[PDB]
């Protein structure tokens, strides 16, 4: 029945997110987001986080709806030193590009074996907001735009040109200003400190 667009409308979704290490941001702002396979095709340099990609979709770019995958992002920030950024991306990508919609992390046993063609389109997208996603329960007070499971993923099977990046969030002012001078036509945001509710927080904390 309902299209992806109408779900977005109804739920007040305004942001997809992609976390990446600042080391990557220049290349992403110049060339846009690309998959592992595509980065290797052109043998581009990149700083990656998940080596094996058990999701089995290295030709896909991983995004989140309305909030980062706080778990996996936190895990990755504990390993590699340095600044991490969060790209804010036009929700239009969900229909303008070939996307699969997973209601939890895509490498999960609960969804990894499902026929990929069944993960595309509005039915699959809608599954991200169920009351119960494999035992992960949606609080009645969770706002509409948030996935039930914070690790719900969008796998985007084509390049995302940099025009689809509506803003970038920085962990501090110096980072933002550095990239603003390099890319003055882009919006580069920052937090004073991370001792606040930020997109670097755990989601329950952020929304509490
Ligand atoms: N990145 C996210 O925000 C995000 C969202 C949902 C789920 N996940 C999950 O987290 C794990 C790691 O995912 P990942 O997205 O870090 O991918 P990954 O670990 O395979 O590493 C790919 C890296 O390439 C970077 N990159 C993209 N375009 C680039 C370019 N033009 N130049 C240089 N680097 C570029 C990406 O930002 C990313 O850091 C996976 O299990 C994934 O499903 C990540």
């Amino acid at each position: 029945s309902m299209t992806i667009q109408e779900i977005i409308q109804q739920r007040n979704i305004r942001s997809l997110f992609h976390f990446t290490h600042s080391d990557n941001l220049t290349s992403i702002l110049d060339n846009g987001l690309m998959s592992r396979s595509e980065l290797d095709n052109e043998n581009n340099e990149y700083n990656c986080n998940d080596e094996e990609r058990i999701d089995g979709h290295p030709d896909a770019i991983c995004l989140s709806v309305s909030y980062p995958n706080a778990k996996m992002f936190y895990k990755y920030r504990c390993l590699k030193p340095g600044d991490w950024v969060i790209l804010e991306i036009n929700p239009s990508v969900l229909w303008a590009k070939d996307c699969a919609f997973y209601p939890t992390n895509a490498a999960s046993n609960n969804v990894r074996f499902i026929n990929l063609d069944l993960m595309k389109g509005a039915e699959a997208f809608s599954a991200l907001f169920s009351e119960n996603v494999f035992g992960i329960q949606r609080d009645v007070n969770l706002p509409s735009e948030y996935t039930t499971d914070v690790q719900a993923a969008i796998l985007v099977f084509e390049k995302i040109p940099p025009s689809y990046i509506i803003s970038t969030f920085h962990p501090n002012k110096e980072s933002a200003e550095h990239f603003k001078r390099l890319y003055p036509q882009t919006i580069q945001r920052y937090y004073d400190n991370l001792n606040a509710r930020t997109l670097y927080s755990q989601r329950h904390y952020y929304l509490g």
Side-chain angles (χ1 to χ4, degrees), residues 49-104:
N49 299 310
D50 175 2
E51 186 57 12
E52 290 208 312
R53 292 290 293 281
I54 302 167
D55 57 278
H57 296 301
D59 47 340
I61 302 156
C62 311
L63 315 178
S64 302
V65 175
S66 297
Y67 204 79
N69 182 330
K71 312 300 187 50
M72 283 179 103
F73 186 17
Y74 176 83
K75 170 205 172 175
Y76 292 135
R77 290 205 306 288
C78 291
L79 294 179
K80 301 152 179 273
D83 283 344
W84 296 78
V85 293
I86 319 164
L87 306 174
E88 188 188 14
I89 289 154
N90 201 326
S92 73
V93 160
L94 293 181
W95 68 73
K97 305 286 155 177
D98 181 21
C99 296
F101 309 88
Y102 295 82
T104 185

Side-chain angles (χ1 to χ4, degrees), residues 11 102-104 110-111 124 126-140 142 146-150 152 203:
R11 283 184 169 294
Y102 295 82
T104 185
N110 296 312
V111 293
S126 190
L128 276 53
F129 306 91
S130 321
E131 289 316 321
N132 191 298
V133 179
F134 306 118
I136 307 310
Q137 300 165 114
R138 187 189 189 79
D139 191 296
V140 53
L142 185 70
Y146 294 105
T147 60
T148 294
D149 183 338
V150 69
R203 190 176 75 179

Side-chain angles (χ1 to χ4, degrees), residues 17-21 24 27-28 31-36 39 44-51 53 55 61-64 68-69 72 76 87 106-107 151-155:
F17 287 111
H18 178 88
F19 67 77
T20 191
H21 191 296
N24 291 326
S27 177
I28 292 171
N31 311 300
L33 280 166
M34 287 177 239
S35 71
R36 290 284 281 278
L39 291 173
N44 299 13
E45 184 194 51
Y46 54 104
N47 168 160
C48 66
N49 299 310
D50 175 2
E51 186 57 12
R53 292 290 293 281
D55 57 278
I61 302 156
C62 311
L63 315 178
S64 302
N69 182 330
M72 283 179 103
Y76 292 135
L87 306 174
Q151 296 208 81
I154 308 308
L155 297 219

